[PDB]
């Protein structure tokens, strides 16, 4: 995997990327999932830069920075993988939230999940960690087939 600060090129061959600044942040764009050379950006924005941040109830908290992946609204032909580190953490429960255009936040859901990873990887060789190894490192795995404006990890 090669490091990026906030941006990288990726095409149909795919690629596996980790932030140079933050090793745990990872983006895996499998072969034949990206239709064209495309410039991917990924920024960790502080919640108070957002004009409407995620609405939280009493015992809820953000467990990462806001994650802005771009280009905003990019569609892949098959799921891409993003791993985001989070804070140690109510209900000891982590959920992933996404906002399409920045004003409305909903919980993120994927057709695929845990078991589809092999298939998702399309024969590329990466080691993705044990779901329990991820829990020990305090890292979330997000499986998505498009980029919303923002993603975030919260605790409910």
């Amino acid at each position: 995997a090669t490091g990026f600060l906030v941006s990288f090129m990726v095409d149909a061959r795919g690629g596996s990327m980790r932030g140079s600044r933050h090793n745990g942040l990872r983006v895996v764009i499998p072969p034949r999932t990206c239709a064209a050379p495309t410039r991917i950006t990924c920024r960790l924005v502080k919640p108070q830069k957002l004009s409407t941040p995620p609405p939280l109830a009493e015992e809820e908290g953000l467990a990462s920075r806001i994650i802005a992946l771009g280009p905003t609204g990019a569609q892949f032909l098959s799921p891409v993988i993003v791993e985001i580190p989070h804070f140690a953490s109510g209900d000891r429960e982590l959920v992933v939230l996404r906002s399409e255009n920045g004003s409305v936040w909903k919980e993120h859901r994927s057709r695929y999940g845990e078991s589809y990873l092999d298939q998702i990887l399309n024969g590329m060789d990466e080691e993705l960690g044990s779901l329990e190894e991820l829990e020990k490192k305090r890292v979330c795995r997000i499986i998505t087939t498009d980029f919303p404006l923002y993603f975030v990890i919260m605790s409910r």
Partner: protein
């Protein structure tokens, strides 16, 4: 007689130092960069005045020493009084330096914060330019978009780097000169340097993005050109056809390389234009 005079003069200086220390010199804290400039200018005139008074103090000391060495009955009293004028004067000198240290700091920190905020706002604007999704409606256009961006990247780079260097030097002059807020300043430096490094990369990827768009358009432009040349030969020597066949072999290779980067609909268009080109070429053979 000389003695009476020495006392009047000592009371005078003490009263003068009192007044500078408590009423002429000020505790005000400047609101902005402009207010600091004003206060620092006023304080340096005041400090120059304190410095000059040093003459009087020395003249008094020399006079007192003359009186003691002359065996005057009050020599003990006079030397003690001078001891006090000297002390109080040195005190006033300390108050003035401290205040000057403080105003310099307040002023530098203000100056630096303006310079930094502006340079960072600048960087933000330049990111926005790098974030353009624009890929080009056609080959003539991408050629121009790519060219304009190469121009933008070099100036943005040249001008940015100089600005970052100056702020970095200014920050080091402050830290190295020893500045109550060095920790904070270093923090600012880190944030600035990271923003810069991110921007350079952002500019770089935009370049790679446009170069790709360039090839895609260059390819479709080349294919159509080739189809036209093949047509002109058909409607129509051996050397001309051979040279054409080399260009076809070359175009085929490009088509393979590109398929590697695209998938779905675009990859289909690429392959399809290759097939069309070879088909026209065969027809000619």
């Amino acid at each position: 007689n000389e003695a009476q005079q020495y006392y009047l003069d000592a009371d005078e200086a003490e009263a003068w130092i009192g007044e500078q220390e408590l009423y002429v010199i000020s505790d005000e804290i400047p609101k902005d960069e402009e207010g600091a400039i004003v206060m620092l200018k006023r304080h340096l005139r005041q400090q120059r005045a304190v410095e000059d008074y040093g003459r009087n103090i020395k003249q008094l000391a020399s006079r007192a020493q003359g009186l003691l060495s002359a065996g005057h009955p009050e020599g003990e009293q006079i030397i003690r009084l001078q001891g006090q004028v000297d002390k109080h004067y040195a005190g006033l000198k300390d108050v003035a330096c401290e205040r000057k240290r403080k105003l310099e700091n307040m002023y530098h920190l203000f100056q630096l914060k303006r310079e930094t905020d502006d340079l960072e706002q600048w960087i933000s604007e330049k990111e926005l330019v790098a974030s353009s999704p624009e890929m080009g409606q056609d080959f003539d256009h991408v050629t121009l978009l790519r060219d304009k961006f190469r121009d933008f990247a070099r100036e943005t780079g040249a001008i940015g780097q100089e600005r970052v260097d100056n702020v970095n030097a200014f920050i080091e002059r402050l830290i190295d000169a020893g500045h109550s807020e060095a920790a904070t300043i270093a923090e600012w430096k880190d944030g600035l340097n990271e923003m810069w490094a991110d921007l350079l990369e952002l500019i770089d990827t935009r370049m790679q993005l446009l170069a790709a768009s360039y090839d895609l358009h260059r390819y479709f432009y080349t294919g159509a050109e080739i189809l036209g040349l093949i047509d002109e030969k058909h409607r129509e020597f051996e050397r001309d056809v051979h040279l054409l066949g080399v260009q076809v072999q070359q175009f085929q290779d490009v088509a393979t390389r590109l398929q590697t980067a695209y998938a779905g609909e675009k990859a289909e268009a690429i392959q399809n234009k290759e097939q069309e080109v070879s088909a026209a070429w065969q027809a000619l053979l």
